[PDB]
Each structure stands twice: as structure tokens, then as C-alpha cells.
Structure 1
Amino acid sequence: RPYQEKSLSKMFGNGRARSGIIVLPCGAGKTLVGITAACTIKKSVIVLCTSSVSVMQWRQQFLXXXXXXXXXXXXXXXXXXXXXXXXXXLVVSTYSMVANXXXXXXXXXXXXXXXXXXXWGFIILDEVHVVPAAMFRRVVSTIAAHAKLGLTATLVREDDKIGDLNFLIGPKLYEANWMELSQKGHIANVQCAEVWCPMTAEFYQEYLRETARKRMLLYIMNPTKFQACQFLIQYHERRGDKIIVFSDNVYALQEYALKMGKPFIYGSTPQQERMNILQNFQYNDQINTIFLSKVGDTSIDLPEATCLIQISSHYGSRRQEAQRLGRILRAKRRNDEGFNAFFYSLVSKDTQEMYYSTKRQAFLVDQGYAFKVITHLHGMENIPNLAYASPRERRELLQEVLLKNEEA
């Protein structure tokens, strides 16, 4: 990819003594850039990752290059260990395993052999936006190499600590514009859209009488959000496109999941059921609407479903939802003549959550994506299958929300 050689030209310029951060999309090949840099340096390279799936991907890249089984390419994890050799090495480690404090499973010595014997020379950190934390400062404080590299896709955080990475690892060298990359490769056009649904009177006065995170249980459970949600679901099913529903709250995800009758993936869920739901979403055309929480978004991103719906949200964590949204957008690439990606933000008027979703839309403006407002698409008035459209169901839902407030 041209931008990858545009990033490698900086390494080809000076050669020795260099450190910086390279911003590349998730769908791009930053791991290939790490492989090329590993071929240019030829030394013990350590790749800092947070999940085993990324370790398996880096191992697959090592297989795409050459060798992995002979005593040279090592693997560090809490399950097994593998030997290494000087002058050339490729190993992937976990942040929580290298960090620690005093808990030990007779494996911290195996890491202190890679760090004690001084077999290093190249540092690779996956997702640098997570570095602003004490454990990563300890990791950097326990390592020292000749060349450092930071592979990440985003860096927008409101912790005011992203600027420290300019001296902890190095200043950002190349930031690729996702619009020009969309022109190089169709990574699904980004259509940002907020749905403005009216707010009922009872949920408005009860919403004002509530506060903190409890008023979210009155912002999400609005009947017009169920009507507009069903209208968007039936609309996308009529267009023949799969639907992914995001929710920062597990309770709302279970409510919409059970009321819509679709599979759901949330916390404390068996992994076999998660894999079954994933296979049903990949193969079965009857399941075109999945309800995914943060566990289903951080662990895996699927290239299907051009329809992304956002209902639940948390205060301040708008940039993280923009990063996950960006992961689902960049995950969809196949060079199509159309390829229209639709992001809907179900927001209710006069609520305290839309005013942060606007900050998320500001993050979506900083990336160059297109944003437009949507009050209501004509067609919901012709859907007799809408729930909570009658005053009876609205009063019953009001009583259910009041009971939910009495439980919390």
C-alpha cells in the first residue's frame, strides 16, 4: 500500500536512532509495516498486545514472512513459553503479564530472562491510545531499545495524556487521512446520522426528576426510541442489509434484544454461545440483526452489516464509541461501486445524552467523515407492527420503567 511506503521512507531516510508513532486504519496493513521494519533491523522484536487473537495474527504475519518454529521466534504467554536466540527474534507479549505487581505463576522469570539477558532492539506497541496508564509507564520504564515504533489507529482522548506520548515513545511521524485512503481503497463511505425522536411528557418530567446514570434508564427506554428502532430494523431488512446494534448498557441491550427477538452477546456470557451466534451471523441469512455490547466489539469486528445503530451511551466515552465505530467502518472493505455505510444515533429531544453524542459527532468531524441530521424518515407512520405506539403500552412501559427505577 502506497501510504505504507510513505511511512517506510522515514525509516529509509536516517536509518539509525528513530522513534515515532504511525497512524494507520485497522483494515490497513500496519503489521506488514512491522514485518518490513523487522526485516530492516533484524533483531529481537517484542510486540506488546492486549489479546491473544492479536498474538495469533502477528504469528500469522511471521508465517507470511519466514520461520517461526526454529529456536528464534519466541512466544510469551501465561500458557506456555518458547526459547529465543540473539541477532534475530520475533516475540509477542501481553501488557498484564509483563506489568503485574506481586502475583506470579512461575512465568515472570521467563519474561525477566528476555528483559534481563538484554535481547532487544525494536519495540512495537499495538494500540498506542491505551498507553496513557500507569502500567504502560512501568512497561516503558522496564524496557530500553535502539528503535521504537508505535502502531495505532486513533488517538482521541479527553484525559489530556495523549500529548505525553511525544516523549514517552516519540512524536507522531505520519498521520494518514482516512478520506484519501477511502479514495485509494473503498473502506465504506461513512454516513453519520442522528435520529431525533420526540420525547413523551411522563418520561420527560420523570427524566428531570432523575439524575446521574439512572436517568439513562429513562433516556433509552423511551417508546419513540422503540418505534424508530423497529422502523430502522424493518427498513434495513427491507433493503437487504444486516444490522448491528451497539449499547453501552447491558440492561438496555437485553431489553431491546428480548423485545426484538434477536441474539445478544453481553458480559458473563459463555464463549460457545458467542461463537454460535457469530457463526449464525456469518452463515445464516435469517439472522441479520445482532445486539453486541463492548465485549462483542472489542474482541472481534465483522466485515458484514453496513447498518450500525447506536442506542445506549455513556458520558465522556464518546471517543471510544467513535473508535469502535471506526473499527467497524474500516473492517468493511471490498471495493464496491456503492458501499454506503449508515450510522444512526437514536437520540431523544431535551435529554442530557444527545449533548455528548454531539461531541462524538465532533470527533467524527475531526476525522473528515460526513455528518447530517435526521429528524424522522417518513414511513414509520405506515408500520402497524410498532410497539409502544398506543397509550396503553406507553403507560405499561412507564410502569415498567418506574419499577426499574425502584429496583436501582
Structure 2
Amino acid sequence: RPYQEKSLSKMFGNGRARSGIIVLPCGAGKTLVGITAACTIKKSVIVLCTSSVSVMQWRQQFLXXXXXXXXXXXXXXXXXXXXXXXXXXLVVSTYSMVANXXXXXXXXXXXXXXXXXXXWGFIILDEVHVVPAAMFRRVVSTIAAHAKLGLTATLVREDDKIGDLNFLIGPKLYEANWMELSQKGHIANVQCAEVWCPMTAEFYQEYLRETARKRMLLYIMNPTKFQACQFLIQYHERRGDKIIVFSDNVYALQEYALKMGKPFIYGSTPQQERMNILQNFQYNDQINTIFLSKVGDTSIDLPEATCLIQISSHYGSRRQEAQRLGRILRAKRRNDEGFNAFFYSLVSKDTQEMYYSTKRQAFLVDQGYAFKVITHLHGMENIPNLAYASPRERRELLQEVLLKNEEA
């Protein structure tokens, strides 16, 4: 990819003594850039990752290059260990395993052999936006190499600590514009859209009488959000496109999941059921609407479903939802003549959550994506299958929300 050689030209310029951060999309090949840099340096390279799936991907890249089984390419994890050799090495480690404090499973010595014997020379950190934390400062404080590299896709955080990475690892060298990359490769056009649904009177006065995170249980459970949600679901099913529903709250995800009758993936869920739901979403055309929480978004991103719906949201964590949204957008690439990606933000008027979703839309403006407002698409008035459209169901839902407030 041209931008990858545009990033490698900086390494080809000076050669020795360099450190910086390279911003590349998730769908791009930053791991290939790490492989090329590993071929240019030829030394013990350590790749800092947070999940085993990324370790398996880096191992697949090592297989795409050459060798992995002979005593040279090592693997560090809490399950097994593998030997290494000087002058050339490729190993992937976990942040929580290298960090620690005093808990030990007779494996911290195996890491202190890679760090004690001084077999290093190249540092690779996956997702640098997570570095602003004490454990990563300890990791950097326990390592020292000749060349450092930071592979990440985003860096927008409101912790005011992203600027420290300019001296902890190095200043950002190349930031690729996702619009020009969309022109190089169709990574699904980004259509940002907020749905403005009216707010009922009872949920408005009860919403004002509530506060903190409890008023979210009155912002999400609005009947017009159920009507507009069903209208968007039936609309996308009529267009023949799969639907992914995001929710920062597990309770709302279970409510919409059970009322819509679709599979759901949330916390404390068996992994076999998660894999079954994933296979049903990949193969079965009857399941075109999935309800995914943060566990289903951080662990895996699927290239299907051009329809992304956002209902639940948390205060301040708008940039993280923009990063996950960006992961689902960049995950969809196949060079199509159309390829229209639709992001909907179900927001209710006069609520305290839309005013942060606007900050998320500001983050979506900083990336160059297109944003437009949507009050209501004509067609919901012709859907007799809408729930909570009658005053009876609205009063019953009001009583259910009041009971939910009495439980919390």
C-alpha cells in the first residue's frame, strides 16, 4: 500500500536512532509495516498486545514472512513459553503479564530472562491510545531499545495524556487521512446520522426528576426510540442489509434484544454461545440483526452489516464509541461501486445524552467523515407492527420503567 511506503521512507531516510508513532486504519496493513521494519533491523522484536487473537495474527504475519518454529521466534504467554536466540527474534507479549505487581505463576522469570539477558532492539506497541496508564509507564520504564515504533489507529482522548506520548515513545511521524485512503481503497463511505425522536411528557418530567446514570434508564427506554428502532430495523431488512446494534448498557441491550427477538452477546456470557451466534451471523441469512455490547466489539469486528445503530451511550466515552465505530467502518472493505455505510444515533429531544453524542459527532468531523441530521424518515407512520405506539402500551412501559427505577 502506497501510504505504507510513505511511512517506510522515514525509516529509509536516517536509518539509525528513530522513534515515532504511525497512524494507520485497522483494515490497513500496519503489521506488514512491522514485518518490513523487522526485516530492516533484524533483531529481537517484542510486540506488546492486549489479546491473544492479536498474538495469533502477528504469528500469522511471521508465517507470511519466514520461520516461526526454529529456536528464534519466541512466544510469551500465561500458557506456555518458547526459547529465543540473539541477532534475530520475533516475540509477542501481553501488557498484563509483563506489568503485574506480586502475583506470579512461575512465568515472570521467563519474561525477566528476555528483559534481563538484554535481547532487544525494536519495540512495537499495538494500540498506542491505551498507553496513557500507569502499567504502560512501568512497561516503558522496564524496557530500553535502539528503535521504537508505535502502531495505532486513533488517538482521541479527553484525559489530556495523549500529548505525553511525544516523549514517552516519540512524536507522531505520519498521520494518514482516512478520506484519501477511502479514495485509494473503498473502506465504506461513512454516513453519520442522528435520529431525533420526540420525547413523551411522563418520561420527560420523570427524566428531569432523575439524575446521574439512572436517568439513562429513562433516556433509552423511551417508546419513540422503540418505534424508530423497529422502523430502522424493518427498513434495513427491507433493503437487504444486516444490522448491528451497539449499547453501552447491558440492561438496555437485553431489553431491546428480547423485545426484538434477536441474539445478544453481553458480559458473563459463555464463549460457545458467542461463537454460535457469530457463525449464525456469518452463515445464516435469517439472522441479520445482532445486539453486541462492548465485549462483542472489542474482541472481534465483522466485515458484514452496513447498518450500525447506536442506542445506549455513556458520558465522556464518546471517543471510544467513535473508535469502535471506526473499527467497524474500516473492517468493511471490498471495493464496491456503492458501499454506503449508515450510522444512526437514536437520540431523544431535551435529554442530557444527545449533548455528548454531539461531541462524538465532533470527533467524527475531526476525522473528515460526513455528518447530517435526521429528524424522522417518512414511513414509520405506515408500520402497524410498532410497539409502544398506543397509550396503553406507553403507560405499561412507564410502569415498567418506574419499577426499574425502584429496583435501582
Shift in Å at residue 123 of structure 1? Answer: 0.0
Shift in Å at residue 45 of structure 1? Answer: 0.0
Alignment correspondent of 2:245: 245
Q: Cα deviation per residue 1:220-251 (whole Å; 9 max; x = unaligned)?
A: 00000000000000000000000000000000
Cα separation, 2, equivalents of 1:58 and 1:7: 20
- Structure 1 unmatched ranges of 5 or more: 64-89, 101-119
Cα separation, 1, equivalents of 2:24 and 2:182: 12
Cα separation, 2, equivalents of 1:161 and 1:312: 27
Cα separation, 1, equivalents of 2:164 and 2:93: 23
Taking only the aligned residue pairs, the percentage that are identical comes to: 100
Partner of 1:234, secondary structure, is: helix
After superposition, the CA RMSD in angstroms is: 0.0
Q: Cα deviation per residue 1:335-377 (whole Å; 9 max; x = unaligned)?
A: 0000000000000000000000000000000000000000000
Shift in Å at residue 50 of structure 1? Answer: 0.0
Alignment correspondent of 2:399: 399
Cα separation, 2, equivalents of 1:241 and 1:400: 32
1:141 aligns with 2:141: yes
Q: Cα deviation per residue 1:246-268 (whole Å; 9 max; x = unaligned)?
A: 00000000000000000000000
Q: Cα deviation per residue 1:79-126 (whole Å; 9 max; x = unaligned)?
A: xxxxxxxxxxx00000000000xxxxxxxxxxxxxxxxxxx0000000
Q: How does 1:255-274 map to 2 (within 5 A)?
A: 255-274=255-274
Partner of 2:343, secondary structure, is: strand
Shift in Å at residue 214 of structure 1? Answer: 0.0
Cα separation, 2, equivalents of 1:407 and 1:179: 47
1:48 aligns with 2:48: yes
Shift in Å at residue 169 of structure 1? Answer: 0.0
Cα separation, 2, equivalents of 1:321 and 1:302: 16
Partner of 1:371, secondary structure, is: strand
Q: Cα deviation per residue 1:155-205 (whole Å; 9 max; x = unaligned)?
A: 000000000000000000000000000000000000000000000000000
Cα separation, 2, equivalents of 1:293 and 1:318: 15
- Structure 2 unmatched ranges of 5 or more: 64-89, 101-119
Cα separation, 1, equivalents of 2:185 and 2:376: 32
Alignment correspondent of 2:189: 189
Cα separation, 1, equivalents of 2:182 and 2:199: 37
Cα separation, 2, equivalents of 1:145 and 1:43: 10
Cα separation, 1, equivalents of 2:45 and 2:171: 20
Shift in Å at residue 139 of structure 1? Answer: 0.0
Shift in Å at residue 218 of structure 1? Answer: 0.0
Cα separation, 2, equivalents of 1:175 and 1:286: 41
Q: Cα deviation per residue 1:276-327 (whole Å; 9 max; x = unaligned)?
A: 0000000000000000000000000000000000000000000000000000
Cα separation, 1, equivalents of 2:93 and 2:156: 25
Q: Cα deviation per residue 1:207-226 (whole Å; 9 max; x = unaligned)?
A: 00000000000000000000
Cα separation, 2, equivalents of 1:292 and 1:281: 12
1:172 aligns with 2:172: yes
Q: How does 1:4-403 map to 2 (within 5 A)?
A: 4-63=4-63, 90-100=90-100, 120-403=120-403
Partner of 1:225, secondary structure, is: helix
Cα separation, 2, equivalents of 1:300 and 1:183: 26
Cα separation, 2, equivalents of 1:312 and 1:131: 26
Q: Cα deviation per residue 1:18-68 (whole Å; 9 max; x = unaligned)?
A: 0000000000000000000000000000000000000000000000xxxxx
Cα separation, 1, equivalents of 2:47 and 2:351: 44
Partner of 2:290, secondary structure, is: strand
Cα separation, 1, equivalents of 2:40 and 2:366: 34
Partner of 1:217, secondary structure, is: helix
Shift in Å at residue 141 of structure 1? Answer: 0.0
Shift in Å at residue 7 of structure 1? Answer: 0.0
Shift in Å at residue 133 of structure 1? Answer: 0.0
Partner of 1:3, secondary structure, is: helix
Partner of 1:303, secondary structure, is: coil
Could you list the structure 1 runs, at least 4 aligned residues long, displaced by more than 4 angstroms after superposition. none
Cα separation, 2, equivalents of 1:385 and 1:347: 21
Cα separation, 2, equivalents of 1:383 and 1:321: 31
Cα separation, 1, equivalents of 2:160 and 2:50: 23
Partner of 2:46, secondary structure, is: strand
Cα separation, 2, equivalents of 1:91 and 1:267: 31
Cα separation, 2, equivalents of 1:61 and 1:150: 17
